[PDB]
């Protein structure tokens, strides 16, 4: 078995918890490069991961290297300046400026359209794995594998078809997660902050109404659907995202359609009128 493969990286800071391991800010001992290092404590996933090394896009965090040594798996990523959760917390008193929200949403839709055009799903979009830099960019990170391998799981961004037991995800799950993040940037509160699967499901139901066959054909036959679910009425989007103009509200409503077949795709969303005046502002970052 392999050893000595990682003495070329000196760990500088602990910067989060990825989808399968802890992530450090590290410094390439040899080249001086500053990177983000995911350590997965341990294949068909050795190939599914290495395919992500080819998935290069301005709005996807660059996967530089996979280092499989000594019953541990390392992912070497480019390092970005801040993640969206921290920036949202830092902007709690003022709010992220709406043009910057719109830039960030637009860029993430571009990243997803690229990912989805390659039939790659993220599966677990969260403010914590959206990374931003000083230049105005935002990038997708920590893609969830179809094969899980290797804190507490956040459920707040989970699409309802996942919660309802759907065995096969579509790209629509990522559009749902990003809609939730969009709303959270605008209102400065999480849209659906459940603390269990059923609390998550029912928080969605209380806001968007309990889905039935009318709005979601097939919902009542899903593995975890129960006829005994409470029947809540749908609230109005004027109540859910007050600061958002009608263009933003209509886009968000389309990202949160219950039926994954009705949910807007990333590429369709790019053409939505909400982006006809999109710009690329600079965040104010305290690093
Ligand atoms: C290559 C490391 C990697 O896989 N990721 C995804 C995990 N994270 C953060 C994790 C969600 C808490 C992460 C962060 C960065 C970064 O630059 O943070 C400042 C880069 C890559 C990765």
Residue numbers in the entry: -4 to 37, 46 to 153, 162 to 298
Which passages does the manuscript contain on this structure?
As a method for conducting allele‐specific chemical genetic investigations, non‐native cysteine residues can be introduced onto the surface of a protein, against which electrophilic probes are developed, such that chemical inhibition can be achieved with a level of selectivity that is typically impossible to achieve in a native system. Additionally, Cdk2 carries a surface‐exposed cysteine (C177) in an allosteric pocket, and this was mutated to alanine to facilitate compatibility with qIT, which relies on the presence of a single surface‐exposed cysteine residue.
Therefore, we proposed that merging acrylamides 1 and 6, to combine the Leu83‐directed H‐bonding ability of the ester and the Val18‐directed hydrophobic vector accessed by the tetrahydroquinoxaline scaffold, would generate an even more potent analogue. Altering the quinoxaline nitrogen substituent proved to be key to improving kinetic selectivity, with the shorter N‐methyl analogue 10 being less Cdk2(ES) selective, whereas the bulkier N‐methylcyclopropyl analogue 11 showed a significant improvement in REF. The crystal structure of 11‐Cdk2(ES) revealed that the methyl cyclopropane functionality extends beyond Val18 into the ribose binding site where it picks up additional hydrophobic interactions, which presumably account for the increase in potency. Indeed, comparing the binding conformations of the merged (9 and 11) and parent (1 and 6) fragments, we observe a subtle shift in the position of the core scaffolds and the orientation of the acrylamide link that likely explains the jump in potency that resulted from fragment merging. Accordingly, the concentration dependency for the rate of reaction between Cdk2(ES) and key acrylamides 1, 6, 9 and 11 were determined using qIT.
